[PDB]
Amino acid sequence: HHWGYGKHNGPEHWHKDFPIAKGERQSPVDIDTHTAKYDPSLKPLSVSYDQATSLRILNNGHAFNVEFDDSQDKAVLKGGPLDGTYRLIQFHFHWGSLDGQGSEHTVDKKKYAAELHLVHWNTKYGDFGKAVQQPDGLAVLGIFLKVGSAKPGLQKVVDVLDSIKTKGKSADFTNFDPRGLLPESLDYWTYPGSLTVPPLLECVTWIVLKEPISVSSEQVLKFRKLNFNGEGEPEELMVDNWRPAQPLKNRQIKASFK
Template sequence: MRDDDVQVVRTGEWCYEGQSRETKCEGPSEWKNLFPKCGGLNQSPINIITSKVEHDPNLTGLIFDGHEDVFNTTVENHGQSVKYNNMLCFHPAHFTLPQSVRLRGGGLSATYKAVQFHLHWGQDGGQGSEHSVDGKHYPMELHIVHIKEKYNNLSVALNDSTGVGALGFFFEVSSEKNKKLDRIIEALGKVRHEGNSSELEDFRLADIVPQANTLSYYRYSGSLTTPDCDQSVVWTVFHQTLPISKNQLTSMYKQLLFRTEKPMIGIFRPVQNLNGRVVYTSVKSHILCVLPNLITLFLCLFCVFGQQKCFH
């Protein structure tokens, strides 16, 4: 067998767009050829069009349990998505979470226990988030993944159409350094190559995520954003962004390598079609209006009295 034949067989797997230009792997537009679920009608991520979201009064305040708890977490670099110990690892690098971290309330049908969290980023401050809002992408997005507490692992939870509860937080570049992210960045630097793992000690989710009672959010039904793209995810995407400095972003991009030893950049799936799905919000339309200037004030008044939806 020729060397290039070996490569074709070996790379008969999914990858991100940037990787597909350099290797013979299947980029996002081709995932459905290998994983039929990726061609489904309820795929994620999506572009949230704020003029079309609907307020749902059932979307009350979320409750985060265990976010204040101190624990040790393991960060691993798999170089690509793999399965181990009957647990699906659907992101090249992730941090494990104890099951004492829970998610409930907020119109969810059950209590969910944490599995892991991971980050999606781009390159040089460009698009890095998977979701977008009115076409705007952010440089990085945090996903915290949970499964219903009655299930033993993620693979089983994926058989339930609402078996997975995922939280999405956008990061926005700030002039000030977010010191609480330094430990995350440092931990990623210790797992640069495929197969590396490291321990992050005395960590709290509350160090990087705000308190639940301060957060408003969007809600929709979707999927995993990597193969097999199972459509079993209740997505909660938050309005409030988290800060990260430009230097911290640059450090993040330089930390990890794919199994090909290429920089782990551009690790996001493009947005998918809504296909008739409705995106809901926990906040009434006029509350989402902000008033930085007179023009915005006029628009907000127009929204309220004209019964139109206004978002910022």
């Protein structure tokens, strides 16, 4: 009876195994755009993905992860609210059964169809497993997806999904350039928070871009053909793998713009 997204094991259940679910800096949150304050001390984000080395794509039974070589400083995030250098380790998405839901963060209560998370770890901590134990261990770049025009840079991901339909399947996924998933503007909101799945560790600096990317209806429909189950088990479509907004508590969301 492990955690997941269903009625019986979904977000409202997680606190029983992971009491940090009711903690002081949980994610995601609603971003109230009128309360978020512009912070002129924030810096432009530096997203340096030119040397990114993708390796593999894995259906882990919750989402799919596109994994990178993080054994040297290749693809890094710095600047913005961050001190120091964070190395890209993986990205993944959260999405809905319908276009009107699927994002984890919300903007003035608006849900997007999906949300991309590029996960990076603080190189001061030496590895990804040590970084998750630290209050400033991770930096996650969050990008909303809306349904409209296709995102050409997403198509290589969509096209491999049929090879990793079920939990525990993986496929080689080299030479994928994550710069093709970025919007035009790097304006962002930032706040301190957590992983959005168990173990729900409070180790994340969240950086959520204001400008969504557009993906096509066909692209997101392909995400919704994946399965949470393993091969040879009853089919459970991988949809609605998002945690709802959590209490902001004693936190301020800062804006890099306006």
